[PDB]
């Protein structure tokens, strides 16, 4: 354990891709099924950088209300977060403000990356030009596709750089 481990909380509406994203980073395969998460499932995720090694403990929370578990409670001691939404579902996006509001209530000013998932789907319903989230210094946005592998690493790279205060970080 020569390097620290940052607590990353993964949040967002049900079926947005949270679990599929994390899973693809961990095994490489893309799950076609949607098996709601119950409470949370913490998964360790490590990346090798040009400066050293960065370790993450991704807290994959549950988007469905009925399976929320300890939502507020998983946020405690987070060094950062990722709020996810479906680009093919206007409702998952209109809800981003509520997820953000609660992360802030527990941790303030931690870096947060907002991802628009499933941009690989031909009929997008939330155009990237509409995103106004990243207008904050500790906030950022990205079009991602857990399926097409598009901008797969971006969120983790941004966060990693913000966390280690070193814009020079690059994954190896």
């Amino acid at each position: 354990g020569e390097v620290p481990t940052f607590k990353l909380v993964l949040v967002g509406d049900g079926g947005t891709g949270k679990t599929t994203f994390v899973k693809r980073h961990l095994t490489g395969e893309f799950e076609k099924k949607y098996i709601a998460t119950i409470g949370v499932e913490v998964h360790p995720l490590s990346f090798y950088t040009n400066f050293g090694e960065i370790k993450f403990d991704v807290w994959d929370t549950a988007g469905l209300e009925k399976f929320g578990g300890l939502r507020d409670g998983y946020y405690i001691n987070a060094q950062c977060a990722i709020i996810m939404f479906d680009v093919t579902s206007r409702i998952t996006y209109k809800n981003v403000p509520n997820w953000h509001r609660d992360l802030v209530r527990v941790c303030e000013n931690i870096p947060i990356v907002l991802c628009g998932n499933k941009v690989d789907v031909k009929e997008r319903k939330v155009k990237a030009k509409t995103i106004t989230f990243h207008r904050k210094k500790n906030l950022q946005y990205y079009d991602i596709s857990a399926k097409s592998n598009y901008n797969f690493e971006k969120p983790f790279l941004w966060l990693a750089r913000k966390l280690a205060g070193n814009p020079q970080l690059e994954f190896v």
């Binding site: 079926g15 709601a36 409470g39 507020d72 814009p167």
Partner: protein, 906 residues
Amino acid sequence: ALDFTVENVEKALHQLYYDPNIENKNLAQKWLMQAQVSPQAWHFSWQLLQPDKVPEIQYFGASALHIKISRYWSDIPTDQYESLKAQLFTQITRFASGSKIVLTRLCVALASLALSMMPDAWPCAVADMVRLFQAGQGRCLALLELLTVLPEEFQTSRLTSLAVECGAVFPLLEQLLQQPSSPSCVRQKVLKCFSSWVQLEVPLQDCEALIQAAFAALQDSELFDSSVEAIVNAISQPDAQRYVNTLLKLIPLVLGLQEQLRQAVQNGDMETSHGICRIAVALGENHSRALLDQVEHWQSFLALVNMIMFCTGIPGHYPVNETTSSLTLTFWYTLQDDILSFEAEKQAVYQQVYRPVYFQLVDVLLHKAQFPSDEEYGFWSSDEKEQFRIYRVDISDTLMYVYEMLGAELLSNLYDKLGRLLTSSEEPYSWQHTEALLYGFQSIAETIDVNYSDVVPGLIGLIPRISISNVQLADTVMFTIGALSEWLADHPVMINSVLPLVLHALGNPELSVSSVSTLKKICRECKYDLPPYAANIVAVSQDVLMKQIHKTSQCMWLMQALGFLLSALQVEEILKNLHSLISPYIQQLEKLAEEIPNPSNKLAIVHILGLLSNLFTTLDISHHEGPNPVVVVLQQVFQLIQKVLSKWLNDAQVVEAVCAIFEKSVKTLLDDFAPMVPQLCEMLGRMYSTIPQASALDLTRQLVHIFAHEPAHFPPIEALFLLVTSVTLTLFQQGPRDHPDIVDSFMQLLAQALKRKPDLFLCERLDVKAVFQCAVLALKFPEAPTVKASCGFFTELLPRCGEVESVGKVVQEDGRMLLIAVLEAIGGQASRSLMDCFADILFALNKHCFSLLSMWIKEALQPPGFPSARLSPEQKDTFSQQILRERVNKRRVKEMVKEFTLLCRG
């Protein structure tokens, strides 16, 4: 044996938060979920909130209380309400000194309680919170937290407007804020409380006084961010346009920030310049036209435009020095939309007034989009450059819309500056100033009306005169060329002045994306005038491909570019050229075809396959948008493909590549694929019988779409259709939810059958009952895309009842199941996102089998609390009535389904 005592919860929390073991964290969290729901939680949580314990521990206690109160209300005996109310108050008063994080959660808790008994049991919640919290600083900050969080929980709770009670909150805020003796902290909390309550249906007119205090608070560093937020939320309200008179009072207030803005820019104070810009842009981008109609106030709106112009032109570069400029773009666009929105008498006056402003904006925008000096740019961070790229995309989009309004003169002005800069004045060389001007042209080059082009020819002539000593400049040149793709098709004589430049850039590895994407554009746009350049283009392409110059993605764009090129050449020339191009790859594939099972081979195999599919995506001699070359190539290649399948059967990625080849070739030649039908069906039929995959169903669906009414070639496809349906049906029994993807393609296939050729359903070899059954269950799947596909099927099925399809109306012996599944979804079993798909099924039931639907629905809603327990028989009847109207249109059925589903959920 661990009971839910404080001691064990603490140990648990410590584990979750500090034990580095992951397995252990997960184990603790599961147990903690149990403890939270247990009724012990009502005893141990107050023990966790003791000064005796650490903050993150105390936190959980308040967290539990908020969850039990907001999500298990029915489990709370009424004899507990008041004593619970009181205990929350007490603890809130106590945590004023302690952790703010816990103080917040406690407030959220008392706020859920409040909202749950507020209409009936707790008549005056807000008024009582105020009275109780008064009789010092801590108490005050507490009440403000409680009052802030309250309206926030109101927006997300499930199960009478709160806005009406705001009339009691505001007086206190005004009182606290206009008093000299209040601390900054109380003031900041008072401005945050205001933002929360404004986010509801509170009329602007009644906020005026707090709007004025917020403005005065801006000059205080401590309260700035809070005011800016409170003010933007006031102005950005959906109902805000209704109160135009107050809008008039807001203009002088925003203008009064001019000096604060200037000073801020001089001092390099980003956060402040950014804050005032947001305020100004909020007024403009929302109430611009209301302000334009009030012509008597034209002088002020003009001053506001100037102010926003000031933020657009802030010195420096967007990402690295000035965040303020980017927020001004959405405004410049709405002003354009507004000006073009009225009759010429008004339009011309304003077009006269604002044309010079948009010319300035273009000058400003072009300077801001200009790259920095090579040295400067070298130290910009990776994220910064990325942000700058996006910012150019945004400016490009706004620049395009400006052209709509300026038009003609814009192109002349730009052409002059560019030509003047290149041939007339020898000034310090700045490829940057040249690139900015060219970039301006590139952003507008697609939207040039086919009327005026005096500028196009001139520009096209200046392009070869430009120095290409910089990658960026070379990329911009290339992009500008491709943007004039359509324009060239009409002026083939100009092609020669650009094609060589583009072909040259094809060899430069650093310009791949731009070069290749432009070649493809030009080939697509001028298929018919490229025949005399075809061989030279083929020559350059082959050379560049031979050398590893482009990445596989760009290589696919090349294959596409080439297809567009060959499609307009005489048959024999298409053959000769095709052979010189693909023969090597086919041979290479043959040598790769007699090899081992390693990935290195795999990569190669996938590459060649994708090259073939991409070329066949683009090559059409029938221009749908002597035999067919493609067909012959396919025939002579088939033996090889089969050899590939035999050795790579288990590989899904390689298989897909083969499927893509035909998927792409079919959409290219629609009738001319006839000769390939029999061979393809055996292949698709064998594939699916061995390893079921969704692309196989999709391919089948394409053949069905094409040859349905072509009896001469359809028979083998009919067999395929039946075979694939027999397998998917067996598969579906076993893994009802294991292959959502296959179910999705399956539903689309069946919907294509009904759409193009319904009589397919009259085949007795196809189990119509089974299909209908699978369809309805599919409706309950978790995967939204599979459910959408299902709704698709029913929408092509129901229109086929009494439409020469006996088997069709026969299955409406099972019709009430469909209605049930639809009402269960609308009840809240399906995502709100899918509502428009289920409304479509309802509409199809009301317009095609109305008699049935009516019996169906009257029965289905009979059981009490069927779709949702939240419903009332009166609400059930109203819905049943509305949906039984015989003339309803999709528009209405969607509106009522949405209204209904909302009542079912909250």
